[PDB]
C-alpha cells in the first residue's frame, strides 16, 4: 500500500489495525416479568398497577401479532424471518425448561432469578422495578402509609413505561423485524448491567470490546398477555484475531490548484488483507485500540480507479470540484504537517516569512527539520518525529479523472453530451 | 433577479432577510456540581443515587488522542493552564453556604453551573424543619433527583464517540437547568444583547475537558460568540411551486434559502443557522456555490432554466405573491366566483397571475376568501421558451438515459 | 402486478391489501383548563401550584407572530383551520367563562352546534378521590403535600411534549384517553384502527386563567376500492458469475386499474388496510413498469452489496433462491443441485423435497405456489445501471474521453 506518495495529493492513512469477528452463536435466554410484586397489599397500591397494565397493551399487542406472524410453513416469508423462526424452533427445545421455570418468579418475590439447569447455560429473569420496590416497600410500611407510596409507584411505573416505549418504539404494527438493542434492556435496570452482562456466563474479556456489545440486537420469542412476560434470545459472541487483516483509516485534505480547493473522495475506512482491498462500512462496528470488532466481514469491492489510486498509479486519482467541508484544509501527519498553503497562510515565524508555494505544486510538506516552528494561527506547540518527503518532490501531475458528485450536474453534462452527439456526425 | 418573470415561470422570492456571523471564539469556563446540601445529617436517600451517578460517569472518565482534533486539542492545551488554575478554586467552592456562589477575578468568570437542584432544595428546606419528615423530605428529594438524573442522562448518558457531539450543547444544559436558569442564563455571562441571537446563544456545542470521578463534577469550557453584521450581503430567499406543461405538471428545484452579496451569491445552507425577523445567523458564511447555467437561470437568460417532473405533492394552493395568486390552474382548476367566471386554459401556460384589481376574490379547489388584497404586482406578458435543459434526479433514470446514449454512440462509432 | 412471470427473477409479492384513508375530518376544539379546583373547601393553597404557569404559558403565548402571514401549502391549510377557530372563539370563551368558576364538571358535553369543548381539567378525578383525605380523614395540609408533589409530576409530564402528537396529551390523562378518543365521534368502526392514527395543534392561549386551546382533527376512515397495496422483496440472481439484483421500492400498488409505487412509510399495516391520509402514487419510469406490466425483458439491474439471506427465501412453501451462494440441497436425496450457467436461479418445487434441510435447518415442504416451470429468456442484460452517482460520473467521464478522442 503506497502510504507515502499520497501525502502530496492530500491523504492521511492512519495505521494498520487488526480485526475480529463473532464466529459462533453462544446463546443464553432471558425472560421478563413487567409487574412488581408486593408482599402484602392491605388495600395498598393496585390502581397504579392497573393503569400501567392498561397502558402496556398498546406496546405488547403488536409484538404478539408480529411474533404470531413470524411462523413459516410450520414444522410443529421474508429473509431474516427465516433465520429468526429457525432460532425460535431451536428455542422450542428449551421451551420445556422455560415453561417449567417461568412460575418461580410469580411464586416468589426476588430481584434476579438464577435458576439454571447447568452451570454453563443458565436462564434468568428480572422484575421490571423490584430492585427499587424493595425500598418502595418501606414508605408503604413502617415509614409512612400507602396513600402516597402508591403515588411514588405510579410515577415510577410511568417513567419506566416511557423508558421502554422509547426503544420498543411502535412506529409500525409490523415492527418486530427491527432489532431491539441490548442497551435499552441494559438500562431497564440501572445498576445491574456491570454484574449480569459480565456474569451471565463465562465472559472474560475486559470492559473495552467484548463487554461493549453496541451493535448487537435481540429477538422476541415468547410474549404473554396474562402474566405479561417477555422472552429474549440473547446471543453472545466469542472472538479471536483474523489473519493478515490490516484496517486503515482514510482522510482527504484538499490540494488547491489555481484557487480551486478540490479533494479526492474516498471512504471513511480502507482495509487490506493479502489481496483483498476494499473500503469497509464500519459505522456499525467498534473502533478498538488496534483491531476493529465487526461481526461480519464488511470488506467489499470498489471502482478499479480507486484501487489504482491506492496501489500507486496516482495519475488516475479523481479530482473533484467542490465547496469543500470545514475539514479538508490542514492537519498533521505524525510529525509531517500538511495544509493547503495557498488559502491558509501558513507562516513560519521562525524564520519569519510567509511560506512560499507555487500554483503548480498542489501542496507541500514541511517536516521537523525544514522548519521546527511550522507557523499557523495558534502555534506554541511541539515538533518531534518523522514525516518523510519520499515522493520525488516536485513532479508533474495529471487531472484527467475529475468528477462531479451531485446528480443534476451530471444531468446537465449529459444533456450537453446529447446535443453534442446530435451535432457531431449528424 | 427578474422577479417579474419568476412570478410567471413559477419560482418565487419570499421574505428577503439579512445575515450576520459570530466568527469570534470568546470562551468562559463554567462547570458542574452534583451533590446538594443537607442540615444535621439527613442523607435520607443521598447514598442511593451517587453510586448510580458514578455508574453514569463510568463511561465519561476515559480519554485519548485531524483538522478538528487540532482545534479540540489546541484550545484545550492553551487552556490546560486555566484548568490548573480553576482546580484550586474548584477545591475551594465544592463546599458552600448557598446554591449559587462562585467568584473569580481576571474579568472572565469561573462561575459554576451549580449544585444541581439546590434552588429547589433551598425552597424544600423550611418544610423539613418545623413541618415535615426526614422521610417525606427524602421522598421529595429522591423523586426530584431521579427526575433530574433522567433529565441529565438524556443529554449525556455516555462517552463513546458521536454522543458528545450532539450531546452536551449549552442549550441542552440550559434545558437541564431550565427551571433554575430561565432568568439568569443571560446574566451568568456578562454579555448582553437582544433576545434573538446572542442572548439565545445559537445551538452551540461545548466539550467536557475534565471530569472528577471522585467528587462527581464535570469541567465544561463554554464557548460564547461575539456577533457583528456583514454588510452588502442580503438574501432573496426561495420557494418553488408546480408548473403545467403540455397538460403535464413539471417544476424546477431550488434550495430552501440563498444569499446575495453585492455581486456574488449562493444557495447558502442554513440548517445550522436560525432564521429571524430581519436577519438570520450562520456561525460561518456558507458556500453553496453553483453553476454558471443556474446563475443565468436565476438572474439572466432565464430560458436556460431546468425543468423537472413533480411526483410527491401538489405544491400550489400556497399560491400567494404580494396579495396576488400564482398557481397551476391549467390543471388545478380555479374559479373567480366574483368577478364571476371559470379561470381559463391557455395551454402554453403553467401559471396564470391574477391581481387583486383583476379578481376581487379568487376561488381555488372550492374555498373563497381575500387577503388584503391591494398590494403591488402586474403582468400581461405571454411567452414561448426554449426547452434545452430537461433534466431529472432519479439515478436509475440518469443511468438509463446514459445507457441509451451508449447504444446510440456505439452504433455511431461502429458507423 | 404480474406476479407469475416475475417469480422467475427473484420477486416476491406478499398480498393485495387495500387502503383506508382520512377524507372526513370532523375538526374538534379542545380547551385545557388547569389548577384543579379543590372540592368546595378552604384552608389550603400554594405558589408552585402556579409557578410553572407563567413559565410555560410565557414560552408559548409569544408564538403569535407567525399567524398573520395569511395576509407544500399546509401553511394555508393551517390558515383555514385557524379561521374556523376564530369564527368559533366566541362560544369558546363563553364556555370557558361558564366552566372556570364552576370548579366541577370535569368534562363538558353541551353540544350546541357540534360536540362540546370537553374542557379537560387536569386532575379533578384524582382530586375527587383526594378530597376525602382532605376532609373527614385529615387536614388539608397532608393534602397540600400530596397535591403539590402530584401536580408537579403532572407538569413534568406536560413539559415532555407541551407540532404535538396527540397520543402524548392523551397520556397526560391516562384514564381519559380512550373515552373521549372513542366516543367524541360515534365510533362503530374498529376503535383499534382509530387508535393507530396520530396533527394536534394549539391555536391560541389564555394567560390570566392559564388555559391552553387546541384544534383537534379526528377523522373518519373511508375505504378506497379498486386499489390494493403490494409489498415487494427482491433477491439475487447470477450471470457469468456476477450476482446482480433488481432495485425496486419497498411497496407498490395498483390505483384503480393503473399501477405505481407506494409509500406506506406514513402508515401502519393491517390485514387489508394501510391507514395513511395521503395517497402515495409516485410515478416511476415507464421503462421500469414495463416489466411489472409483464414486458420483463426491459428491467434494470445492479451489482449486489448486502448480507446473505436476501439471496434465498420462500414462495408459498416452495423455496426460491440462487443455488450458488446457497447450494440447493433438496433431500431427494440430500446432494448439491448446481445450475446451468445460463440461469441465475431455479424454481424448485414439490418433486422429491419432503422436508428440506439446506443450511442445516430442517423444515417442511408441500409447496402450493404453482407454475413449476423455469425461465428461458433472451440474453436480456441490457439495463446494467449503477446506483451510486460516483460510478456514473466516472463512467460518463470515460465516455467523455472516448467521444473527445474519437471526434477528431
Amino acid at each position, epitope marked *: 500500500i503506497d502510504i507515502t506518495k499520497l501525502q502530496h495529493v492530500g491523504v492521511l492513512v492512519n495505521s494498520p489495525k487488526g480485526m475480529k469477528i463473532s464466529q459462533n452463536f453462544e446463546t443464553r435466554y432471558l425472560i421478563l416479568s413487567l409487574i412488581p410484586k408486593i408482599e402484602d397489599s392491605n388495600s395498598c397500591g393496585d390502581q397504579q398497577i392497573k393503569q400501567y397494565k392498561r397502558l402496556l397493551d398498546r406496546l405488547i399487542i403488536p409484538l404478539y401479532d408480529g411474533l404470531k406472524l413470524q411462523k413459516d410453513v410450520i414444522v410443529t416469508a421474508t429473509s431474516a424471518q427465516i433465520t429468526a423462526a429457525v432460532a425460535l424452533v431451536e428455542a422450542k427445545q428449551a421451551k420445556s425448561d422455560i415453561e417449567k421455570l417461568k412460575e418461580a418468579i410469580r411464586d416468589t418475590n426476588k430481584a434476579v432469578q438464577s435458576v439454571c439447569s447447568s452451570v454453563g447455560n443458565c436462564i434468568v429473569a428480572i422484575k421490571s422495578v423490584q430492585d427499587y420496590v424493595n425500598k418502595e416497600i418501606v414508605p408503604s*410500611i413502617a415509614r409512612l402509609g400507602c396513600e402516597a407510596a402508591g403515588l411514588q409507584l405510579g410515577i415510577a411505573l410511568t417513567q419506566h413505561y416511557s423508558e421502554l416505549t422509547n426503544c420498543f418504539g411502535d412506529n409500525i404494527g409490523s415492527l418486530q423485524e427491527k432489532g431491539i438493542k441490548l442497551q435499552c434492556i441494559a438500562s431497564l435496570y440501572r445498576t445491574n448491567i456491570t454484574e449480569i452482562f459480565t456474569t451471565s456466563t463465562v465472559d472474560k474479556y475486559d470492559i473495552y470490546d467484548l463487554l461493549f456489545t453496541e451493535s448487537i440486537k435481540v429477538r422476541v420469542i415468547d410474549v404473554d398477555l396474562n402474566d405479561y412476560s417477555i422472552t429474549l434470545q440473547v446471543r453472545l459472541p466469542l472472538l479471536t484475531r483474523l489473519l493478515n487483516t490490516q484496517i486503515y483509516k482514510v482522510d482527504s485534505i484538499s490540494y488547491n490548484i489555481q484557487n480551486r480547493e478540490w479533494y479526492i473522495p474516498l471512504p471513511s475506512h480502507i482495509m487490506t488483507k493479502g489481496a483483498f482491498l476494499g473500503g469497509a462500512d464500519v459505522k456499525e462496528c467498534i473502533e478498538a485500540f488496534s483491531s476493529y470488532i465487526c461481526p461480519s466481514d464488511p470488506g467489499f469491492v470498489l471502482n478499479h480507479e480507486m484501487e489504482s489510486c491506492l496501489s500507486g498509479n496516482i495519475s488516475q486519482c479523481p479530482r473533484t470540484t467542490v465547496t469543500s467541508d470545514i475539514v479538508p484544509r490542514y492537519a498533521f501527519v505524525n510529525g509531517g504537517v500538511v495544509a493547503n498553503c495557498i488559502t491558509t497562510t501558513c507562516t513560519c515565524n521562525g524564520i519569519g516569512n510567509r511560506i512560499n508555494q507555487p500554483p503548480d505544486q498542489g501542496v507541500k510538506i514541511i517536516t521537523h527539520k525544514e522548519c521546527n516552528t511550522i507557523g499557523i494561527n495558534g502555534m506554541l506547540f511541539n515538533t518531534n518525529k518523522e514525516g518523510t518527503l519520499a515522493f520525488y518532490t516536485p513532479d508533474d501531475i495529471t487531472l484527467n479523472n475529475s468528477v462531479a458528485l451531485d446528480p443534476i450536474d451530471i444531468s446537465i453534462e449529459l444533456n450537453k453530451v446529447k446535443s453534442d452527439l446530435e451535432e457531431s456526425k449528424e | 433577479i427578474d422577479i417579474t418573470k419568476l412570478q410567471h415561470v413559477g419560482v418565487l422570492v419570499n421574505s428577503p432577510k439579512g445575515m450576520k456571523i459570530s466568527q469570534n471564539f470568546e470562551t468562559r469556563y463554567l462547570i458542574l456540581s452534583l451533590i446538594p446540601k443537607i442540615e444535621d445529617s439527613n442523607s435520607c436517600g443521598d447514598q442511593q443515587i451517587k453510586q448510580y451517578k458514578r455508574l453514569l460517569d463510568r463511561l465519561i472518565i476515559p480519554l485519548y488522542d485531524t483538522s478538528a482534533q487540532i482545534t479540540a486539542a489546541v484550545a484545550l492545551v492553551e487552556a490546560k493552564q486555566a484548568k490548573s488554575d480553576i482546580e484550586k478554586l474548584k477545591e475551594a467552592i465544592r463546599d458552600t453556604n448557598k446554591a449559587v456562589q462562585s467568584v473569580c477575578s481576571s474579568v472572565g468568570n469561573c462561575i459554576v453551573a451549580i449544585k444541581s437542584v439546590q434552588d429547589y432544595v433551598n425552597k424544600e428546606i423550611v418544610p423539613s424543619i418545623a413541618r415535615l419528615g426526614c*422521610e417525606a423530605a427524602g421522598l421529595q428529594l429522591g423523586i426530584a433527583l431521579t427526575q433530574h438524573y433522567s433529565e441529565l442522562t438524556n443529554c449525556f448518558g455516555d462517552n463513546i464517540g458521536s454522543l458528545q457531539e450532539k450531546g452536551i450543547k449549552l442549550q441542552c444544559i440550559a434545558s437541564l437547568y431550565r427551571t433554575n436558569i430561565t432568568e439568569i442564563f443571560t446574566t451568568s455571562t456578562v454579555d448582553k444583547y437582544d433576545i434573538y441571537d446572542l442572548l439565545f446563544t445559537e445551538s452551540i456545542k461545548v466539550r467536557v475537558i475534565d471530569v472528577d470521578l471522585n467528587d462527581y463534577s464535570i469541567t465544561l469550557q463554554v464557548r460564547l460568540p461575539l456577533l457583528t453584521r456583514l454588510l452588502n450581503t442580503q438574501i432573496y430567499k426561495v420557494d418553488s411551486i408546480s408548473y403545467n406543461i403540455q397538460n403535464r405538471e413539471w417544476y424546477i428545484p431550488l434550495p430552501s434559502h440563498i444569499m446575495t452579496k453585492g455581486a456574488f451569491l449562493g444557495g447558502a445552507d442554513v440548517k445550522e443557522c436560525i432564521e429571524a425577523f430581519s436577519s438570520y445567523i450562520c456561525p460561518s458564511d456558507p458556500g453553496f456555490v453553483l453553476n454558471h447555467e443556474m446563475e443565468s437561470c436565476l438572474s439572466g437568460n432565464i430560458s436556460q432554466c431546468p425543468r423537472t417532473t413533480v411526483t410527491s405533492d401538489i405544491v400550489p394552493r400556497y399560491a400567494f405573491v404580494n396579495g396576488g395568486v400564482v398557481a397551476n390552474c391549467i390543471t388545478t382548476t380555479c374559479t373567480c366566483n366574483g368577478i364571476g367566471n371559470r379561470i381559463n386554459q391557455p395551454p402554453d401556460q403553467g401559471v396564470k397571475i391574477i391581481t387583486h384589481k383583476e379578481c376581487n376574490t379568487i376561488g381555488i379547489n372550492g374555498m373563497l376568501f381575500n387577503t388584503n388584497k391591494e398590494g403591488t404586482l402586474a403582468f400581461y406578458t405571454p411567452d414561448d421558451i426554449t426547452l434545452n435543459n430537461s433534466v431529472a434526479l432519479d439515478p436509475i433514470d440518469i443511468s438509463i438515459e446514459l445507457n441509451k446514449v451508449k447504444s446510440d454512440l456505439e452504433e455511431s462509432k461502429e458507423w | 402486478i404480474d406476479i407469475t412471470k416475475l417469480q422467475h427473477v427473484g420477486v416476491l409479492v406478499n398480498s393485495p391489501k387495500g387502503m383506508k384513508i382520512s377524507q372526513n375530518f370532523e375538526t374538534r376544539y379542545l380547551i385545557l383548563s388547569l389548577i384543579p379546583k379543590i372540592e368546595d373547601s378552604n384552608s389550603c393553597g400554594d405558589q408552585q401550584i402556579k409557578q410553572y404557569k407563567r413559565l410555560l404559558d410565557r414560552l408559548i403565548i409569544p408564538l403569535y407572530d407567525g399567524l398573520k402571514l395569511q395576509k407544500t401549502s399546509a401553511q394555508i391549510t393551517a390558515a383555514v383551520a385557524l379561521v374556523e377557530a376564530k369564527q368559533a372563539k366566541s362560544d369558546i370563551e363563553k364556555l370557558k367563562e361558564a366552566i372556570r368558576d364552576t370548579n366541577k364538571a370535569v368534562q363538558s358535553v353541551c353540544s350546541s352546534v357540534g360536540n362540546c369543548i370537553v374542557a379537560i381539567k387536569s386532575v379533578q378525578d384524582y382530586v375527587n378521590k383526594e378530597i376525602v383525605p382532605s376532609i373527614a380523614r385529615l387536614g388539608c395540609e*397532608a393534602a397540600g403535600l400530596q397535591l403539590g408533589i402530584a401536580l408537579t409530576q403532572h407538569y413534568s409530564e406536560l413539559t415532555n411534549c407541551f407540532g404535538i402528537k396527540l397520543q402524548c396529551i392523551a397520556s397526560l390523562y391516562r384514564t381519559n384517553i380512550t373515552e373521549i378518543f372513542t366516543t367524541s365521534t360515534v365510533d362503530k368502526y374498529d376503535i383499534y384502527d382509530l387508535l393507530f392514527t396520530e396533527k394536534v395543534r394549539v391555536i391560541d392561549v389564555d394567560l390570566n386563567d392559564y388555559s391552553i386551546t387546541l384544534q383537534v382533527r379526528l377523522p373518519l376512515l373511508t375505504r378506497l376500492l379498486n386499489t390494493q397495496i403490494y409489498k415487494v422483496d427482491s433477491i439475487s440472481y447470477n450471470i457469468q458469475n456476477r450476482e446482480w439484483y433488481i432495485p425496486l421500492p419497498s411497496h407498490i400498488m395498483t390505483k384503480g386499474a393503473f399501477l405505481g409505487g407506494a409509500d406506506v412509510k406514513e402508515c401502519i399495516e393491517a390485514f387489508s388496510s394501510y391507514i395513511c391520509p395521503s395517497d402515495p402514487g409516485f410515478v416511476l419510469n415507464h421503462e421500469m413498469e414495463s416489466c411489472l406490466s409483464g414486458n420483463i425483458s426491459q428491467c434494470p439491474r445492479t451489482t449486489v452489496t448486502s448480507d446473505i439471506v436476501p439471496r434465498y427465501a420462500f414462495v408459498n412453501g416452495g423455496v426460491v433462491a440462487n443455488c450458488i451462494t446457497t447450494t440447493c440441497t433438496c433431500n431427494g436425496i440430500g446432494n448439491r443441485i448446481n445450475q446451468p450457467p445460463d440461469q441465475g436461479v431455479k424454481i424448485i418445487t414439490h418433486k422429491e423435497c419432503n422436508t428440506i434441510g439446506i443450511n442445516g435447518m430442517l423444515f417442511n415442504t408441500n409447496k402450493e405456489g404453482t407454475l413449476a416451470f423455469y425461465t428461458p429468456d433472451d440474453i436480456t442484460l441490457n439495463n446494467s445501471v449503477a446506483l451510486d452517482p460516483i460510478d456514473i460520473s466516472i463512467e460518463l467521464n470515460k465516455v467523455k474521453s472516448d467521444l473527445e478522442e474519437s471526434k477528431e
Partner: antibody
Amino acid sequence: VQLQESGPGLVKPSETLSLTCTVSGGSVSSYYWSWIRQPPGKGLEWIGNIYYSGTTKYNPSLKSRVTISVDVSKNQFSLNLISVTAADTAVYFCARQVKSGWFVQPFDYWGQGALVTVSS
Amino acid sequence: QMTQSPPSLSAYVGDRVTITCRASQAIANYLAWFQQKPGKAPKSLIYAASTLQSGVPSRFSGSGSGTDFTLTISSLQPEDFATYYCHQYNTYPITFGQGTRLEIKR
C-alpha cells in the same frame, strides 16, 4: 369518652390469644382506634392500628403474627394473634385518638390495664 | 427515635422543671407528651407540642421544634407524680422513650 377492656389473663405458650375492647359512649365508624402494649418492667411498644373500614397496620417488629378486628354494631374491637410466646408477658392498653394534620397519632386515651400473665 | 434526658428528677415543689427530648433522627413533626400514672388509666396530654388538651391546666406548656424539644412548668404540686414520655410520629412505627420517673420531695 370511655374505653374498657375485657377477656382472660392467662395463656400457655405458643397458643392463640384474643382479647376485646369496647367503648362506653362516643361514636364508632368515624375514625380509628389502636393497640399499645408494654412489658411490666420497661418500654412501650406499638402493636398496630384498627380502622373502621376493616384496615389494620402493624409494627414490623411483630410482622406477620397478628390480626385486629372490627365491630361496628357492638362498638368494639379485639385482637387475635397466634405466636403467643412467654416473653410477651405484658399489659395491653387501648387507644382512641384523633386527627392532626400530616397523619394521625394513636396513644393512651382510656385503658385501665389488660392484666396479662402468661405461663408454662 | 426518641429518648429522655433525665431518667428521674428529685425536684421539690416550687421551681421550674423541664426536659430536653432530642429527636434521632432530628426532625420536626411533633410529639405527644403523655403522663402514665401507675394504678390508673393513662391519657394523652400535649398534642403537637403546645396545643395542650382540653381541661388540662395552663401550668404545662411546650416550647421548641425540630431536633429537640423542651418543657415549661412552674407552680408545682404533688398530684403531677407520674411517669411521662415523649414521642416521634413521622417515622410510622410509633416510637416512645425510656421514661421520666419524676420524684417530688419534702
